[PDB]
Amino acid sequence: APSPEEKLHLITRNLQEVLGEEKLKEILKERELKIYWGTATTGKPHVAYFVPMSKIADFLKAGCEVTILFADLHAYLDNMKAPWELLELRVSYYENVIKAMLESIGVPLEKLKFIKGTDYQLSKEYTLDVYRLSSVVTQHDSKKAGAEVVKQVEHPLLSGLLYPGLQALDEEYLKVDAQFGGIDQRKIFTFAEKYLPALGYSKRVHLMNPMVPGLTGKIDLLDRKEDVKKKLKKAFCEPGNVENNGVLSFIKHVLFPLKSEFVILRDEKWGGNKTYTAYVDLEKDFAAEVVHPGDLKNSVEVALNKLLDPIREKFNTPALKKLASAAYP
Amino acid sequence: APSPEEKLHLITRNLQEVLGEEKLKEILKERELKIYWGTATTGKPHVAYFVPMSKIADFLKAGCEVTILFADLHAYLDNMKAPWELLELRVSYYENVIKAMLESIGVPLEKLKFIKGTDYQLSKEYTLDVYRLSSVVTQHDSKKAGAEVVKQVEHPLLSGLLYPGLQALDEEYLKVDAQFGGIDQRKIFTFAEKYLPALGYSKRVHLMNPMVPGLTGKIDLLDRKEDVKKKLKKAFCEPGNVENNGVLSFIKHVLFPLKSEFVILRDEKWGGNKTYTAYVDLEKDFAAEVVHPGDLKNSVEVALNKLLDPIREKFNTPALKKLASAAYP
Numbered sequence: 167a168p169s170p171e172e173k174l175h176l177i178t179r180n181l182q183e184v185l186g187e188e189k190l191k192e193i194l195k196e197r198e199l200k201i202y203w204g205t206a207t208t209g210k211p212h213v214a215y216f217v218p219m220s221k222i223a224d225f226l227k228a229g230c231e232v233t234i235l236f237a238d239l240h241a242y243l244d245n246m247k248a249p250w251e252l253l254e255l256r257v258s259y260y261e262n263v264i265k266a267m268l269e270s271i272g273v274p275l276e277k278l279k280f281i282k283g284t285d286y287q288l289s290k291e292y293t294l295d296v297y298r299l300s301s302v303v304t305q306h307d308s309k310k311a312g313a314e315v316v317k318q319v320e321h322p323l324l325s326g327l328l329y330p331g332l333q334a335l336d337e338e339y340l341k342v343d344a345q346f347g348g349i350d351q352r353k354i355f356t357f358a359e360k361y362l363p364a365l366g367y368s369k370r371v372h373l374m375n376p377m378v379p380g381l382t383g384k385i386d387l388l389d390r391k392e393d394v395k396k397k398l399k400k401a402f403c404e405p406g407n408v409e410n411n412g413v414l415s416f417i418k419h420v421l422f423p424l425k426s427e428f429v430i431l432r433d434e435k436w437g438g439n440k441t442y443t444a445y446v447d448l449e450k451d452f453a454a455e456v457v458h459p460g461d462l463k464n465s466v467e468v469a470l471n472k473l474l475d476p477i478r479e480k481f482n483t484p485a486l487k488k489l490a491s492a493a494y495p
Numbered sequence: 496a497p498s499p500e501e502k503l504h505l506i507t508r509n510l511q512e513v514l515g516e517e518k519l520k521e522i523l524k525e526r527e528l529k530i531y532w533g534t535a536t537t538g539k540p541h542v543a544y545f546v547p548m549s550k551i552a553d554f555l556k557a558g559c560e561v562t563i564l565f566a567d568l569h570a571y572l573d574n575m576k577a578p579w580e581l582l583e584l585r586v587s588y589y590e591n592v593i594k595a596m597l598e599s600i601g602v603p604l605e606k607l608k609f610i611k612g613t614d615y616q617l618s619k620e621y622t623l624d625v626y627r628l629s630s631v632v633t634q635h636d637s638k639k640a641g642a643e644v645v646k647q648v649e650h651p652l653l654s655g656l657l658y659p660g661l662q663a664l665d666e667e668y669l670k671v672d673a674q675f676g677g678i679d680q681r682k683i684f685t686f687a688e689k690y691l692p693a694l695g696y697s698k699r700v701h702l703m704n705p706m707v708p709g710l711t712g713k714i715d716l717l718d719r720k721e722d723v724k725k726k727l728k729k730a731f732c733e734p735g736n737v738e739n740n741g742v743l744s745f746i747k748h749v750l751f752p753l754k755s756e757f758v759i760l761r762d763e764k765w766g767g768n769k770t771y772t773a774y775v776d777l778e779k780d781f782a783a784e785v786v787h788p789g790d791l792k793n794s795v796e797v798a799l800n801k802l803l804d805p806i807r808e809k810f811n812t813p814a815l816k817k818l819a820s821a822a823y824p
């Protein structure tokens with residue numbers, strides 16, 4: 167144990183869609199799945215990142231060989247969401263904060279592989295494949311593949327058209343069996359399944375998380391407890407409304423996978439604390455309005471601060487404080 | 496001698512247009528001009544290539560540092576006008592036949608620099624510049640820049656959009672002051688003048704030859720004398736018509752620059768042979784119809800076979816015969 171079935175459950179739970187179930191099961195019957203998740207080194211990571219980090223935790227529990235890609239070249243190709251000089255600083259910021267999040271949720275880092283895009287995306291072999299891919303990929307398909315990912319501007323830049331192709335090639339160069347990302351990556355994922363074979367490379371399994379609403383409808387990973395409270399003070403959390411609820415979503419995608427349970431802090435007057443072992447049970451109580459928005463938020467606030475504490479402490483140094491400012495002037 | 500003025504004349508004679516006269520004169524007042532001409536390693540070079548070779552001869556006579564680029568990657572990016580496996584064979588064929596043409600017209604090869612695109616177009620520094628360029632070049636401008644150069648197909652490939660940018664970057668990596676090509680390269684040349692400065696590189700001088708009508712309205716450099724005659728037997732050469740005349744054009748752009756004169760072979764009955772020292776004088780006589788199409792063609796046929804003889808002899812070996820067949824199955 168875990169059995170192939172148990173691994174499949176851990177790997178696919180909470181996902182919106184799985185592409186390649188046949189191959190996925192063939193792999194799990196014999197060996198560990200090789201999978202990666204990529205993130206362009208753009209904006210400062212916020213609490214929403216705990217969502218993909220939770221799936222990464224699931225992959226490791228399932229015995230997967232996991233790689234995290236810091237896509238610095240992609241950040242540059244996406245309408246320069248980060249200058250080339252600041253890219254290296256942002257890669258550092260991302261590496262430090264992502265590792266901090268993983269340590270916070272108790273994910274062993276000794277087995278995770280961290281890689282930067284420019285570590286191999288400028289190599290001759292990779293570049294040759296970019297040109298080979300460009301010879302078969304139509305301008306049309308490239309533009310369509312990145313519609314929901316690359317910033318759409320009035321006068322589209324050539325860089326935006328290259329973006330999808332490099333993400334596809336990353337699957338082969340990182341030597342993975344699968345790629346995990348949000349459902350917003352779907353068009354790039356299908357693009358990769360169609361074109362990698364054209365270059366003699368295998369199509370990969372694709373795991374897609376749903377687009378989860380945020381807690382603030384953003385809470386920075388380094389925000390002080392005071393700001394966390396203030397930002398939570400809002401958040402779309404209407405009584406009895408279980409849809410488009412960022413607070414419930416955070417519990418479903420982050421807290422339950424982490425602790426396997428969720429405790430609602432509630433006054434004795436209204437029933438006292440209650441421990442839920444399944445998200446569906448909590449949702450039922452929220453819909454019945456026996457779990458008040460204020461108590462739901464307070465319960466998440468306590469749990470979130472527990473996740474952020476070690477992170478805020480880690481970055482409480484002159485060096486890291488300097489990096490944060492340098493990476494984001 | 497040659498003086499800066501004499502060099503400018505040799506460099507610009509017969510051209511349709513010169514972009515950058517100010518800088519060109521500034522350079523010639525102090526040093527030798529660095530210039531290159533590129534050719535994608537696609538179809539088998541034919542007699543029309545003597546036109547650009549004649550300007551290359553002019554550049555060398557003017558003391559220029561000349562580079563000839565065998566653009567193999569470009570041949571691949573232009574709707575695969577040559578597979579990657581055959582590219583190296585075609586580069587070899589091009590190198591051998593272009594050098595043969597230059598030797599035939601008496602151009603010293605010891606000072607000419609021959610370079611293959613893939614010798615540097617796959618380097619990390621060049622690749623980084625391709626991505627930097629892609630961040631500022633719009634899809635629109637890239638498509639527009641190659642309209643008259645890259646094969647236009649129903650479903651445009653991404654490779655076609657990259658083509659112009661690499662040709663622009665070639666100017667910087669080949670470290671030249673200018674680029675020479677046909678007027679059909681104009682949109683790529685203006686594209687390079689606009690975008691290289693965006694990357695901190697200098698705009699280059701651009702020399703453009705007119706689009707010269709061919710002798711056959713194609714005569715291969717290795718065609719036997721019998722086939723040369725047969726193909727010349729046709730050719731658009733109407734009596735008294737000095738426009739769109741491929742025979743007159745070959746004399747103007749190749750034979751006059753080579754010999755500084757042109758001899759018309761004509762029977763005593765019609766005036767006997769006549770030696771012209773200026774193309775305009777020959778054109779006047781052709782317009783007056785005192786130089787018959789048949790005699791004009793015969794005069795060019797004799798001169799052309801003199802140019803092809805050493806080339807046909809050079810490739811009259813088992814090795815080169817094998818290469819020709821291998822490069823073009």
Ligand SMILES: N[C@H](CO)Cc1ccc(O)cc1
Nearest residue numbers: 204205206237240315333336
């Ligand atoms: N497209 C992703 C951000 O939406 C980031 C990315 C993921 C995987 C890669 O191989 C490259 C970039």
Ligand SMILES: N[C@H](CO)Cc1ccc(O)cc1
Nearest residue numbers: 533534535566569644662665
């Ligand atoms: N575009 C040219 C053929 O029409 C070939 C070429 C010329 C110069 C270069 O740097 C690259 C390709």
Ligand SMILES: [K+]
Nearest residue numbers: 205206208209
């Ligand atoms: K990001």
Ligand SMILES: [K+]
Nearest residue numbers: 534535537538
């Ligand atoms: K060519």
